[PDB]
Assembly symmetry: T
Homo-oligomer: 146 residues x 12
């Protein structure tokens, strides 16, 4: 259905934007605990790319047309823009946490309709939520107060 296709397209553009932001932060981060932040951003980008590809193949299987162009992503993404200069570790961790939370929350919005329509795709969304939440936890644990 066109509604299902549109929801999956909104998820896909958010995943692509998240991957691009992760790579940009991976390149442009400075500060403490550099090696771990560097490796974690790479792992997150790999996982996000794999999830985006899986969504693309599934949505193709359901006979929909994907929209993953750069202009389309820039026009329809929901993630906030990222700073273009070198950033401290606390700031980049905070920004990554916020972006991951927004990406997860969009999927949590669409989950009800996706489960009502196709449990097979609901399972892929469940796996994506699991992976993204694990990544978000392991990153956000750096800046915890206690």
């Amino acid at each position: 259905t066109p509604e299902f296709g549109g929801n999956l397209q909104k998820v896909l553009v958010d995943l692509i934007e998240l991957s691009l932001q992760g790579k940009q932060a991976h390149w442009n981060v400075v500060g403490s605990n550099f090696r771990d932040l560097h490796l974690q951003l790479d792992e997150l980008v790999d996982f996000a790319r794999e999830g985006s590809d899986t969504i693309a193949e599934r949505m193709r299987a359901l006979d929909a047309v994907p929209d993953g162009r750069s202009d389309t992503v820039a026009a329809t993404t929901t993630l906030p823009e990222f700073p273009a200069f070198e950033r401290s570790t606390a700031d980049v961790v905070d920004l990554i946490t916020t972006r991951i939370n927004a990406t997860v929350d969009t999927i949590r919005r669409v989950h009800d309709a996706v489960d009502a329509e196709d449990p097979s795709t609901a399972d892929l969304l469940h796996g994506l939520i699991d992976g993204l939440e694990k990544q978000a936890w392991l990153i956000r644990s750096e800046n915890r107060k206690v």
Copy 2:
């Protein structure tokens, strides 16, 4: 130097645009001889991602500031936009060949200044142009009729 940083930034944004659009074509292509294009476009995307990461790390080592944001890519890329909807294999082969030719032409234009300033970065450009030209040959040989 800022001009050197800008010359590398143009290459970086071109590679990111190429990778995203190659993934788009990988998801979207249908028609005769589908599987060969489906696999080779994935290989092209992998190579483009590796090259973009290599350029980002090298230019960071040379103390410059990357701009890999989606908005920046959309605003300052040189590759023409990818047409939407399902496309035939011949058309996608032609479009990918033209775009890879544009990218390698950009590499050729920047190569003079890059070699004049840093031979180490010139070597990375040589490797990238070699790989991209090999990919371009393997793609365009599909549509050749002799």
Copy 3:
């Protein structure tokens, strides 16, 4: 739960019959773009065998009695018979697409009944839908004209 056992037996019989047809077509197919089909049918057979074994072991865990005999498969399968001679690639692609469609439609009918009892087996069926539909798309894209 005799109804659960019968439903899972109907699933397994169709999976085994489809695997046999896939192997026969893999051995028999010939024509334009032969190699891609030759490899993809092998991949589909491997996936079908993995799914059939997984279903059989799950249904064993639930204390049911599987029936995987050749006579039982031939007597209780739902998929149509396959041509016995050399077939063109377009025809074999169409036949394989029809077979995958019938198999996934069978799981679609049994889905609600099996989810009424066991969400765990529902998850396995979701995975089978994901894989089979991905294979169906990747094969049917061969004959698509647009």
Copy 4:
């Protein structure tokens, strides 16, 4: 959410107790099919450890605090204690079957609440039920007669 944390803590403590008791049986089992039981119990312990780690990371990523201390396990576990000395093969198979049945029963009680609140955790619990039931079948098949 505190109730959710409580159910997940019960799951984690049951899994930890199962792993410890399985290692006990692994070191202690003597009798016929000794090598078979030795390998299978090691596989069961490995799977239980993987599942316990997955559950712990999931619930802690959902902002809960795990309690996997030995005193907590002893005080709040639900599995009955293991024999103290060398046991026959049939007896240890029966004991392990009973332990796995109790664990999966607890998971089944928790399943309703987890499906009510977080489908992502429900999916992990489904996978755990699948793995534990497969192991239980493979173990209990030793003692079953015709």
Copy 5:
């Protein structure tokens, strides 16, 4: 030659029947020494599937048409029909021994004509014979007494 194709088709259909028999027994076997029988039957199925695929590819290379449909298997198989329900260890090992012996006996009768016509295919037949005989030894040696 048509007679050569007929003998190779007989061997192929026998191997397919053996693979189906092995998988069914693998799923269904219950009793003593169960884990080892479970692993050995899976190994036998893997070997039988590889041999059947090898014969199919060879006969296709020699310009013959294979017949691996389930209906054809049921109509032209030579292995006697297998029990329907759960069976003890002695019964299953004895039955598997009888089917393997029947298969190798059929291959033995075909071997004379195959060696008369094509020694290259005769070598593949020899490999199948001794692999199957090794598997038969490992299986029947369980029931043997002193």
Copy 6:
């Protein structure tokens, strides 16, 4: 001898308690320099589990009876308990260092009695010292101030 068996059982209890407490710390740790501790405590738990299994199998080979039940561990362990809530990274490093020091000092007491009978087991005890002391240094170096 029963005294040797009791000493080995006491060592095994300490190893199991250390592994469980390490997993607790791995789950519950939070604060600055997270990922390093998160990976390193997992490595320590893996090594401790390997050592505990090896020592259990060795003591079984020497014809003794292991006691690895949760109640037995809680009743006869020597390592003091772990905090039940989220702790700072410096504190968890200090506690883990203390636990490892207690465990290795227990081995230091038991070593003379072990070597008085069995140099082969003394070698395994030496290996345990090597691994645990390397891990202890690798953890304690976090808070070292020169």
Copy 7:
């Protein structure tokens, strides 16, 4: 000595086939290009392995190999290959014809080589199997029905 001569004739044909496969691998264009490109590389690898196996076996049987380029050019029986870009159908046809000639000479030598040494007969049987499988797997592209 005749045994050595037959094995030398086999070896030069295998080397020529490997060179033919590499040439077609580099110089092929048209439809199904990626599949033909991979298949020809696999065939070249198999031909090189078979040539090595024959060379080492015949060395073990105390003969003197002749695998020089001049010797191959003077003694091989495979037809000459075109030196320009060729369509895929023509490439498949030419490769099929060359493989058929190569397996034909092996079948011709098989009787004497098996009568003299079953161990070498086994290696030649394996080579026949592999090359015939490759021949079918390539020639299936241009089949009519």
Copy 8:
């Protein structure tokens, strides 16, 4: 030292005899738990071969002359000769247990002089004792009753 050479020669000849015994039993064993015995005897043969090679290379490094000839082994080894025909499971397990016990007893007598002269070789002896005793446990634990 000639006495050192003689002790290590006795060790080597005993290891070679044990390897031959294990391989013969591996080929010849028939009865219950056949596949487990077949795998374990192969593992024991592999371990014995590795240990024999290690002892030979160590003794050669210490400027002695190894004697691994079959005639020397037959004339010098202390392990009693094996049955010549097919043997039952209990009998072969008992025979292997007795052979391993004799070998480790010989190693124990030699270990005193070995530790007196060269601790480096004493370490290898300890490793061999550990491995052989573990294998002996996995063997003799088969026939043990409660």
Copy 9:
């Protein structure tokens, strides 16, 4: 087929004696070009062990009883005894060449009688000839002068 069994026993005895002599030379060889011989004799022993195991399992599959005892191989082997002291590289090369020639001569002599009954075993004999003759060529080329 007692004659067949005796022939296969003669093959097995020769292979075992060859492996033992190869290990002895591998331990004892010394002189110019030492390392190449040291590695190649190890490879020869590995191949001989593989061949001996293959022959033993094949003759077990043919319902025969092998005799691989040390006394049996010493009293039945045909290979000449090996020097017991340090030997020059040329001498050990000559001795190994002679031993391999005797071993392959035995197989060539028994080949006609073997093929008179079982072509599958004849195939294994062909493979053994191939491997042993390759090893013989590599050994003999060391001392060749031209």
Copy 10:
């Protein structure tokens, strides 16, 4: 350009001739220190084949026509012919060194034009010079006497 195409064609035919030459020497060489040269020539052949394939793919990418036919190689090669029959190792090393030096001389002669035209291809020639010179040293230092 045709002159550049011919410049690379000379390199290609020289590499193919070198590969066949190395294979001939690998098969034919006998004498002292056999195994070292036997493995080294195989490594040389592998490197030459990889380099020839790389040059062929690059020159295809740059839209030229390879001529790798055996007749073309024989007619236009530059390496001296290899004498037949069995040759001593010293003569083989001398001839291989001379031919590799000739190939490196050809590469160096064409390198000026190649670098003036295409730096990407110049890099490939640099890599080939590195590899071939390393092989030349690793072979020629055999015959060196201080």
Copy 11:
């Protein structure tokens, strides 16, 4: 030429000194963020060893005489002396950054003559500069504050 040999010898001794000093720092680094520095210094040592070996093999191929003795390194190195004892992480990061900068600066000075004489060796120098600069950036970014 002797000048080229000396220019390469200076780079070789600098690389050896850098590798030894990196190992020194790997051993005596303590403080906050220990593990990341501990791993990065090991990676740097591995890269330095690989580069030093590559330079040694290349300069050997070009018929020069290496001087990698400890006395020669101590006498002719250019890197400043590394202070002993345990050092804080900030200080060791600064020291390693300064040393890598000195090494790459020396390589930059020698690059002109190296490129003027042998472009192949210039390529190796380019690769070494790339790797060392990447490592230097990845280490120095730890201490950066923005």
Copy 12:
């Protein structure tokens, strides 16, 4: 204790000097058996580096500080100097044998105090002696007269 630390430092500097001279001989050796010595010395350098790192980690764990600087090695090492020119293979083999003998002599000298203070460290020294003596034999067997 300071004496323990000093002895471990004496061992470490000897290992580092041995590794450096091994690399020098690896680069510098020419003559017969060149490939054999080239591989063997590379293996010895790898082993020496691993052993030196292991000693550094252990003595760090025991709260001591290493001195592995180039100046410290040159001032404190006990190994004789290595020639700086091209040497015959016999001479380099003799020199390496002498160096290994000196290195193992130092460790055997310190072994008494090391065992009196820490059996675990004595075990590491035993392993180092075993490895170094094996390498020493495997090298010096080249130049043996008889």
